[PDB]
Symmetry: C2
Amino acid sequence: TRDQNGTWEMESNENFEGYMKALDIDFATRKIAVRLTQTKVIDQDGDNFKTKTTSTFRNYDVDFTVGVEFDAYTKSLDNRHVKALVTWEGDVLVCVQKGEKENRGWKQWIEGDKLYLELTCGDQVCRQVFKKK
Amino acid sequence: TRDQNGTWEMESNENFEGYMKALDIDFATRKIAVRLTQTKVIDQDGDNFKTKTTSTFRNYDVDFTVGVEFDAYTKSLDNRHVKALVTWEGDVLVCVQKGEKENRGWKQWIEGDKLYLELTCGDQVCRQVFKKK
C-alpha cells in the first residue's frame, strides 16, 4: 500500500547517533536526541503529504508519601541526590529538597482547573502553570 | 482541596532558564530544554502520590507533493538547506535531499501495522520503525 495515513508511534530507532554524527550535530543535542521517542502524524491525499513530527521523552516517575522523607535523584534535571520531604501547608504541597544546593524546593497547588508548581533554587524561582485536561 | 488528581498540561513555564542555570545545567542544554512543554499525570491516594511527567518537543511540520521539488531547512536536525524531491519507487516513498552532504535522503514505506523510515547521510543509515497509535 501507498497509504501512509495515520498517527505513528516510534518503536525502534537504530543508529540515530551515527546519522546525527554524519550531520555534524553537536554532542549536547545528540545526547538528548538519542533518548527521544517520536510520534509522526501523516495526512496524505494521493500525492499530497502533510506530516507533523513530535519528539517526546519520559521523565522518571516521582512517587512519594507526604510526611516521609525520601532519597531522590533529579535525573530529569541536574542529576543530583537530594533528601526530599513533602508536607502539606493547607492544601499546598510543600517540598524541601535537602542537598548540595542551598534553598532548593518546590510547592504545588490547585486553583480552579489549574495546577501551579513553583520550583526554587537559590535566588531563582520557576513558576509553572498547568491546565486540567 | 488536597486533591491533585488528574492529567495536567503545561500552559506556561516562567523563568525555566534561570532556574536551570541555578541548577548548573549547561547553556546548550538549557537552549534545547526551554523548547519543551510538559504533561503531568498525578495519581493520588490520600497522602500517597505517584507522578508521571512527560516532556515534549514540537518539531518540524513538513508538507510536500510527490514529484514537486521544494527547498527546506532541516531545522529539527542540522539546520542545513536542502533541495528535496520525493518520488515513488513501488510502494516506497523516496526523498533525495540535494545539498552539502553527499548521499543524503530518506525512504519511507508501510509493511502491515508498521511504518519504516530509513534516513541516510554519507555512509550512515538510520532505520526507524513506527507502529499505529
